[PDB]
Subunit: 164 residues, 2 copies
């Protein structure tokens, strides 16, 4: 309930110990990660990344359509060559339709949001297949694209085989 | 040279020792962070977050305009009531213009990206003030918005005063 106070206090400890000031921009692993904003996922901890390893792109659902701007920059300015797409169990984007979220915006804010496309999905493994195939199909994304489901209940990354 | 193999092996060590499987979806701190995908920023270490604390939204430059979809879902489905925006020193989005990036896509892939907006900025502090002011102005975002510069050189978060 004092979030600004808490994160500044923590950051003061982080900076006292900090030794990574000379890391370059371009990610060491030539890797870009796309995943959800979900609070339970520390990407660095889950994948064993360190500072400088991979670009980490996060949005509600980990949607590749919205990650594309960031992935083109990741490859063209950062030299990344590979994408991993990681959707997860118990994702809010599985539970609700565009119409469902628009009703919540009306109820709570009394605002109309009928022109915002919130990009939910109806099946968790389909959404990973769709998002991998999207990036492979894009003329603006180079290199291999691997899909995963992160299991929030176990801490477990599950590779998907995505064809075509 | 084996990113997929390396992340799966690192994930097997993480899962072996994981016991956070019953964390709820809604973030404990009722907080959304918006920052850059930059590989040198571990958000959890920089801010002192643990799994389940805060939604973390990352894109190229940490731009609020693109983060809005994710922020509305964060607040309306995840109960967050606050936003922290963090841009950083040595960001790619400072250095290069839309024309610069479009030219690189033409030179490297042979593609025309003349109708993709990359969301670059011309001044780091100005980028944070525009982004915070953007979210404060939005009828779709509730709560306080605080803006920061993260210094890649010394691990330091610096709060900006943003007027209006
Ligand atoms: Zn999610
Ligand atoms: Zn950046």
């Amino acid at each position: 309930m004092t979030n600004v106070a808490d994160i500044e206090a923590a950051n003061a400890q982080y900076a006292a110990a900090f030794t990574k000031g000379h890391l370059p921009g371009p990610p060491k692993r030539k890797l870009a990660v796309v995943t959800c904003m979900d609070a339970r996922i520390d990407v660095f901890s889950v994948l064993g990344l360190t500072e400088g390893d991979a670009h980490v792109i996060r949005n509600a659902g980990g949607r590749a359509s919205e990650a594309l701007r960031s992935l083109i920059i990741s490859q063209r300015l950062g030299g990344t060559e590979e994408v991993v797409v990681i959707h997860h169990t118990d994702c809010g984007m599985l539970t609700f339709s565009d119409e469902d979220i628009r009703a919540k915006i009306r109820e709570e804010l009394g605002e109309d949001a009928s022109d915002i496309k919130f990009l939910p999905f109806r099946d968790l493994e389909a959404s990973v297949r769709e998002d991998v195939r999207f990036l492979r199909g894009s003329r603006l994304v180079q290199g291999n694209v691997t899909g995963y489901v992160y299991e929030v209940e176990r801490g477990r990354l599950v590779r998907l085989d995505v064809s075509d």
